[PDB]
């Protein structure tokens, strides 16, 4: 969530 | 409002349906089997089908889309390449050797004491790092002429098997000796110690004292695999390897040294990288003296408050739609219910918390039910009410919303609920459509990724996930035909260029997607 394309964007919230 | 509002050639209402993909297969297809007379008509004649997953939206190939990624790509008018995809492209196209920050780190070593370190998780786990990235780093550093290079190998055993370490160790040894003939292994220690993220600084200190002081078991290239095997026989696996020390003092992080962490996942790098370069070595509570004048580089940004240069720093995302409209002095409206409110703000606006001049926001409360299958319509009627209010007012030349139910009710797996959510969504879309025709707006309907079109697995089991299907792009304006890009499928990056064209506004150079309509 810290920057666009970081690891949290791989799968997101759901 | 804002000064140039009326200069627009067409006002545009953009609906982003959440989890509404295009499947011709009717089995478990909540959209097809729901009553959807509105989308049946909007998704006919001149409409498009655009990609919302995989490499089309900057994610690895075969990876389903998601709300954060999809709203980001829609709002940005460009593919935002996810770290894994980005670095893998750099590796395949030999772009490390021209990477600005890497050249900067090698220049620092070359102009200083000649010493450079690599540190990070050594395996093919792909969650925090990839061994292939480290090898490409060594090759590029060699070609940039750095005098002296050391590697600090963090054992995995968590994203890979607990006894795979010895194989990555063997590879690394052989690669340094025979493939590059350049670079030396200095440290082996488990991620348990090196890659803590729970402020357990007694764990960090083990890794820190190994890197800085050589506190651990002495070995060399001939012996270190055997050392590891003995730890395995003792039941100490990769994650938990206690330090092994190679090259003696030469291989420690010393005064004036430069260091590159090569993990691209930030959370488990923040503690050890701050111990080395952000004045947090004190929390390690070590008796060793801390080296002076260290410079740290990370593969990506680990914390914006860190002074470290990054080899792959964040996409700046200048002039996403929301910013560009304010720059053109055009006002705008963003509406969602609670569950997707961040998606029409933080993510739609470029993956950061910034609200632009003339941008109005509206939140509709989601219903307070245990699970959303218990109220499949969620708050779609309310989102539509607020959008119709804006269309009757005519103030904002661009208005957009999210409809939550197909995604959020799909995640429950309850097929009949998903049908009701798709019917509630279609009803709301039809009410917005009628308001747009009555007040002079063009309607475009899309989605951020699929979900509710596949509610059953082949074995008839519940399917509670997003999909790799295409999503719709519709357009009520009759003066336009949908056209494909020259070189690729259309995708979410093309939504915002198309809106701007339809609106008669300029496309910023940073939007590298393309309008997929012709006039
Ligand atoms: Cl992990
Ligand atoms: Cl983890
Ligand atoms: Na239907
Ligand atoms: Na699904
Ligand atoms: Zn979802
Ligand atoms: Zn979504």
Author numbering:
A (entry chain C): 1 to 14
B (entry chain A): 20 to 538
Task: Provide passages from the article that reported this PDB entry.
In all vertebrates, cofactor-dependent phosphoglycerate mutase (dPGM) is a 2, 3-bisphophoglycerate cofactor–utilizing homodimer consisting of 23-kDa subunits, while the parasitic enzyme is a 56-kDa monomer cofactor-independent enzyme consisting of a phosphatase domain connected by a flexible hinge to the phosphotransferase domain. In dPGM, an active site phosphohistidine (H10) equilibrates the phosphate between the 2 and 3 positions of glyceric acid, while in cofactor-independent phosphoglycerate mutase (iPGM), a transition metal ion–activated serine (S86) mediates the phosphate transfer. We previously discovered ipglycermide, a potent inhibitor of iPGM, from a large combinatorial cyclic peptide library. Our results show that the high-affinity binding of ipglycermide to iPGMs freezes these structurally dynamic enzymes into an inactive, stable complex.
